[PDB]
Design a protein around this ligand. Structure first.
Ligand SMILES: Nc1nc2c(ncn2[C@@H]2O[C@H](COP(=O)(O)OP(=O)(O)O)[C@@H](O)[C@H]2O)c(=O)[nH]1
Ligand SMILES: [Mg+2]
Lengths: 151, 136, 151, 50
């Protein structure tokens, strides 16, 4: 078996005029991988969750537009498009904050689960919060989190 | 005359913004001109700590070290200006943006907008580098 | 930047400097920076080193200055000195200098305006797509109906 | 097969299959101006109805 490593241009370059190319590289990384490593610093930020939500939906929509003309689309029935998204690995670099939530120590995996956990219920107060998380729960069932100290 | 310790000026009552009347009355009793310094940025970036340094104190605005958000709403500290006699320095410490447990995501915009409106100096606090997201 | 050492201020100005050209490839890039150039003419940047060893970050306010990074202690002092020396008294239109009561009035005016809906909300990028595309979908469906009935 | 995936998806992006959402000030203007039309119409309907 062959291991294939894909290193990507980083998002949010403040000298880059083509800001839409950031989404294109992100979408290509999702489409071409079997394992997706999402690299963040210090903490899980809402912006990082929302960007993953937005790109995943755009990636599912692009993939749907290249399925009905594809003979490689016709070889399965019952598996949804979500089942072919890569496994998610969340890396937290330069990690220093206490892994404690509500007086309880948590693992990095439990920290990731708490951050991505949909609030219970059906009200308007929760719809915006649960929208990226319902998507991430759907397209990335298998998640893993890793912490890395300052090196 | 001035405040020995900071107080909450604007609370997040449920998910609505509500002003604390005690902090308002102490603020309106303030007769001198005010130099108003507000900090804003992502959560867990050492904002509260840095604002205590502007008050010249080791403690003041509450600091925590967990992954959870700490500062909520907007806190106000009215202290003497350290160099201008007869002037007041006002420090505004803010709830951090991008909290992944916060349901009311639009409250981040409200706190940011209030910090811009109420200040004369705006401190934008970021980590490591200038990010495009922070500019946008 | 580009083989030249820059100050923190020069780094901030480079990041926020508008591209020359006036063409479509530069419009998106120039949009936030034209606004920031207009609303914040006077800008200053400050760098702060990592303030202490990573295991002692949790207790940072309780530590004495010799346990922190020496550059960090100096950088904090330089930041505080600049704020105290260059910050102005808050002003309002008509040559009005803000005091406590006027600041209280501004707090009440803006809090009430937010509570009455005067402040727009930044929506999620996916819901925004659905709003645009579904509105266009209604118009296409109506145009198809009008064509079929008109014939 | 991976080469095929690279070529397929790069072409799809290059031909516009990836949706593009516009910026901030235009998106704000689109929302607020649409709401402004609705408010203006509601005011007209109230004035004429009375
Ligand atoms: N890495 C780093 N941590 C800091 C710095 N300043 C304070 N801290 C620590 O970061 C944690 C969060 O600080 P806090 O003031 O609550 O951040 P805030 O949420 O933005 O107000 C605290 O444990 C501080 O001791 C800094 O400059 N760098
Ligand atoms: Mg704090």
């Amino acid at each position: 078996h062959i291991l294939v490593l894909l290193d990507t241009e980083g998002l949010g370059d403040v000298e880059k005029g083509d800001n839409q190319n950031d989404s294109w590289i992100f979408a290509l990384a999702v489409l071409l991988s079997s394992t997706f490593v999402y690299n963040s610093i210090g903490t899980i930020n809402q912006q990082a969750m929302d960007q993953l939500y937005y790109v995943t939906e755009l990636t599912h929509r692009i993939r749907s537009k290249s399925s009905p003309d594809e003979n490689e689309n016709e070889v399965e029935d019952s598996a949804d498009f979500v089942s072919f998204f890569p496994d998610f690995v969340w890396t937290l670099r330069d990690f220093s904050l206490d892994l404690e939530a509500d007086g309880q120590p948590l693992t990095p995996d439990e920290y990731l689960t708490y951050s991505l956990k949909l609030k219970k219920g059906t009200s308007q107060k929760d719809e915006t919060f649960n929208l990226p998380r319902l998507c991430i729960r759907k397209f990335f069932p298998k998640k893993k989190c890793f912490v890395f100290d300052r090196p | 005359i001035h405040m020995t310790g900071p107080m909450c000026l604007i609370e997040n009552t449920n998910g609505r913004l509500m002003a604390n009347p005690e902090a308002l009355k102490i603020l309106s009793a303030i007769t001198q001109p005010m130099v108003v310094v507000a900090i804003v940025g992502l959560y867990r970036t050492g904002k509260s700590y840095l604002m205590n340094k502007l008050a010249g104190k080791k403690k003041g605005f509450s600091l925590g070290s967990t992954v959870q958000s700490h500062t909520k709403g907007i806190w106000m500290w009215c202290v003497p200006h350290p160099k201008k006699p007869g002037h007041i320095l006002v420090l505004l410490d803010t709830e951090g943006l991008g909290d992944v447990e916060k349901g009311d995501n639009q409250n981040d915009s409200w706190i940011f907008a209030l910090a811009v409106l109420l200040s004369s100096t705006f401190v934008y606090n970021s980590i490591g580098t200038i990010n495009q997201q922070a500019m946008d | 930047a580009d083989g030249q050492p820059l100050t923190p201020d020069e780094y901030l100005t480079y990041s926020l400097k508008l591209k020359k050209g006036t063409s479509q490839k530069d419009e998106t890039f120039n949009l936030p920076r034209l606004c920031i150039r207009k609303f914040f003419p006077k800008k200053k940047c400050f760098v702060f080193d990592r303030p202490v060893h990573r295991r002692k970050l949790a207790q940072l306010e309780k530590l004495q200055d010799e346990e922190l990074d020496p550059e960090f202690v100096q950088q904090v002092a330089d930041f505080c000195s600049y704020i105290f020396s260059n910050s102005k008294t808050k002003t309002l239109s008509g040559g009005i200098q803000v005091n406590g009561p006027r600041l209280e009035s501004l707090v009440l005016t803006y809090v009430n305006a937010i509570s009455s809906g005067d402040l727009p909300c930044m929506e999620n990028a996916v819901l925004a797509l659905a709003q645009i595309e579904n509105s266009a979908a209604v118009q296409k469906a109506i145009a198809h109906y009008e064509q079929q009935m008109g014939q």
